[PDB]
Design a binder for this molecule. Structure first.
Ligand code: HEM
Ligand code: HEM
Ligand SMILES: C[C@H](O)[C@H](O)C1=Nc2c(nc(N)[nH]c2=O)NC1
Ligand SMILES: C[C@H](O)[C@H](O)C1=Nc2c(nc(N)[nH]c2=O)NC1
Ligand SMILES: NC(=[NH2+])NCCC[C@H](N)C(=O)O
Ligand SMILES: NC(=[NH2+])NCCC[C@H](N)C(=O)O
Ligand SMILES: [Zn+2]
Lengths: 409, 411
């Protein structure tokens, strides 16, 4: 019932009671753990309970659990569901839900900032052009001249599933990926398929290495449209090294605003299929994953060469040595240009603090170790030695099929 | 029920059917994953099934399933069980059992070597002095002057739980740890409690930074006894760096033979509480964990200073830079002294090949991602990008309580 988690470096032991309020499944079973697997419309009857569960936690959060207001609201929503087969959240409920979906995101190491989320209610939006406007405003607000501010923009909830709002991009801002005749890949291999669905749509791609993709926005279930994010709104950082002047020659740059846009936000049974959100980068995301993954910009060898390291045998740890230098470059570049960014040591330390805060004020904190531990220097960060319990709490952010595999033009 | 795992770097997808043979539990439920939790006597009733299961797997592997030999053996065992409440494994079965416990060890990244395990049958052992001798032979055989060979020595199985054989040490070779009155620790902090027990039992502690601990051996449920491993049998490697001549001045060194000695080997329902086993090190075990964990030797700062790195702000990644150099030092020193060792890049690439092979020839490979991924440079090793399924098959190696917590002292 009550589970405990120990940190093997500090001996601190926490008791988890929050998992008792878990609803959704985890992919795991008493017989098999799938903790390392990346990816393990509602009816009136289904919706009622979800809405009730949500309202209970909401009113409980405002110290009005069981109050007339609570009962009234519950009755009101109940009537609305029976009638409209769905319901609308109050602005207050919307903000609470979004903040909590972030609070409940077990794979996010940056949750100590959860309560500071800026919520942009775009539920009144009706067209793709309207979505573009809302998105540009989000980008400008969150970028804030490099002094990044977390934010989320929430478009209209799902209805019948044939009038869904969707942002086809996986991130508001990402670099293009095109398959060369050379057999190689120019730009970001991760975005080849999406890039081709755009280019196909008429996008005149400079067919370069770091070309900002266009937004492909889908409003009310209609076919998506393209738009070029005002260049003046896309903050980018040229990557150079504090010691290797040849580094800048590598010709590397990355954008400053990480804005996941293909997820689905669920609050009280309601599904918000277009809910782009953004925060700021943890260095390793760019330096380790985006730059060094073999299926991404895969730049290790080239950097190793420039460093003139013995790349004859893996045991010289040339990959490791290079990895560190690259990551030092990313952090240096961002910091130099006054753009918000956090190193993995600092971020993990704050997550440990957040976990403790969460355990005492809330009884726990769902966390996915596989995702929380940074992709480099694992055991050198405190989270590596921290036992974590992963479970699903709602409101939540969920994965959802890429639209081009569901859309019917 | 077929379960598929995908590698996100190569798109290769594998199907697992082997998990169906899993009967033990994981600690997880459909509502909570305990994948990152370190630690999530039998009766005739329960022993019969366990024995049959094992013998069936054994006879199938030798292509004699259903043979008369298979049937007679089952008959022989059950009779022996009802007759004595337990049973004895044939030599062949023990070897098969030990090899498979290794093959089924989900936290081990070195399993591509599972079939080459050298098994030493020490089931005829009756005393602690006898255990010492078997252990000395195991160390000399496994060390092989630096050309390490994997081995395991198996002492008598548990009977009534009152006559257990146990190796009180956590590893056959490990350095003492001493808590100082000023609160600091001399040596290895992970072994402070065991070191205290040794001293209490009579060990005269040299009180240095790298003192090899004495063996504390328990035979047949009796109080444990102390033995010193012949120094000439303990291979050590002074740690130096190929470019930084001051590294050697840190006075670091480590032993070459990693030999876990506190786990329990379960085969056919039988429990072998003393089953020390050894392989060879993956560099990061020493370089990242033993040397850089804050609760171990914790040398990152010192190394960092000597390298004159900006230690004012973490964003300099001075911790990361020093960590890399230290691991370069460990590999280089072992290679120079011609002592077997494998870097994490090489070991993980080998595990991926082993895992794919296992899926094809066995239908799966239980693996604990949390343990398999190296403690440094995770994503630049292939295992990071590999989805894995964690489940428990027997034969298996299991954790067991430290003996000082359960032992009934005879005096
Ligand atoms: C303020 C700075 C923030 C930091 C430093 C941070 C950091 C991280 C990191 C490093 C990851 C893993 C990224 C990856 O490997 O792809 C992550 C994942 C995630 N974060 Fe945060 N985050 C921040 C803000 C946000 C915000 C504002 C939200 C939502 C409102 C959020 C929701 C999530 C979710 C749901 C995931 C998992 C996404 C997936 O499964 O791909 N994060 N975050
Ligand atoms: C041949 C060389 C070997 C290599 C390179 C190898 C490598 C490793 C490594 C890197 C670990 C993680 C250790 C830690 O973090 O403490 C591990 C764990 C493990 N290995 Fe292997 N191993 C080898 C041989 C063996 C042998 C001979 C056996 C058994 C017969 C074995 C049984 C296990 C088990 C059961 C664990 C988990 C131990 C625990 O929970 O503390 N390994 N191995
Ligand atoms: C297979 C495995 O789940 C996958 O390679 C992982 N991806 C990620 C991870 N962690 C983060 N933060 N992001 C990932 O994409 N941990 C492991
Ligand atoms: C809490 C967490 O499970 C613990 O810190 C871990 N220990 C280890 C690990 N992996 C290995 N190989 N060895 C460990 O001791 N992964 C994580
Ligand atoms: N810190 C964040 N909000 N990250 C969101 C995902 C960004 C992704 N990991 C990237 O490297 O582009
Ligand atoms: N490769 C092995 N067999 N390792 C066994 C565990 C050794 C332990 N991790 C150590 O650093 O001492
Ligand atoms: Zn699990």
């Amino acid at each position: 019932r009550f589970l405990k988690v120990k940190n093997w470096e500090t001996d601190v032991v926490l008791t988890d009671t929050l998992h008792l309020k878990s609803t959704l499944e985890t992919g795991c079973t008493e017989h098999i753990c799938m903790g390392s697997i990346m990816l393990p419309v509602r009816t009136k009857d289904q919706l009622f309970p979800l809405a009730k569960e949500f309202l209970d936690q909401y009113y409980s959060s405002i110290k009005r659990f069981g109050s007339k207001a609570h009962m009234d609201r519950l009755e009101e929503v109940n009537k609305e569901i029976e009638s409209t087969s769905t319901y609308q959240l109050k602005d207050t409920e919307l903000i609470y839900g979004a903040k909590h979906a972030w609070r409940n995101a077990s794979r996010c190491v940056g949750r100590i900032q959860w309560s500071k989320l800026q919520v942009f209610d775009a539920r009144d939006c009706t067209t793709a052009h309207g979505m573009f406007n809302y998105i540009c405003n989000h980008v400008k607000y969150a970028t804030n001249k490099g002094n990044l501010r977390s934010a989320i923009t929430i478009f209209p909830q799902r209805t019948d599933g044939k009038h869904d709002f969707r942002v086809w991009n996986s991130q508001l801002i990402r670099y293009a990926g095109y398959k060369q005749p050379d057999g190689s890949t120019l730009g970001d291999p991760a975005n080849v398929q999406f890039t081709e669905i755009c280019i196909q749509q008429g996008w005149k791609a400079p067919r370069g290495r770091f070309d900002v993709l266009p937004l492909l926005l889908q409003a009310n279930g209609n076919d998506p449209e393209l738009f070029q994010i005002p260049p003046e709104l896309v903050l980018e950082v040229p990557i150079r090294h504090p010691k290797f002047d040849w580094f800048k020659d590598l010709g590397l740059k990355w954008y400053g605003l990480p804005a996941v846009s293909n997820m689905l936000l669920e609050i009280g049974g309601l599904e918000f299929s277009a809910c782009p959100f953004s925060g700021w980068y943890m260095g390793t995301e760019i330096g380790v994953r985006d730059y060094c993954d073999n299926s991404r910009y895969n730049i290790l060898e080239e950097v190793a060469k420039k460093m003139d390291l013995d790349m004859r045998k893996t045991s010289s740890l040339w990959k490791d040595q290079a990895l560190v230098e690259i990551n030092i470059a990313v952090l240096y570049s961002f910091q130099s240009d006054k753009v918000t960014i956090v190193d993995h040591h600092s971020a993990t330390e704050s997550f440990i603090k957040h976990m403790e805060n969460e355990y005492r004020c809330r009884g726990g904190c769902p966390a996915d170790w596989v995702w929380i531990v940074p992709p480099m220097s694992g055991s050198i960060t405190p989270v590596f030695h921290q036992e974590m319990l992963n479970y699903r709490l709602t409101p939540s952010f969920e994965y959802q099929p890429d639209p081009w595999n569901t859309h019917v033009w």
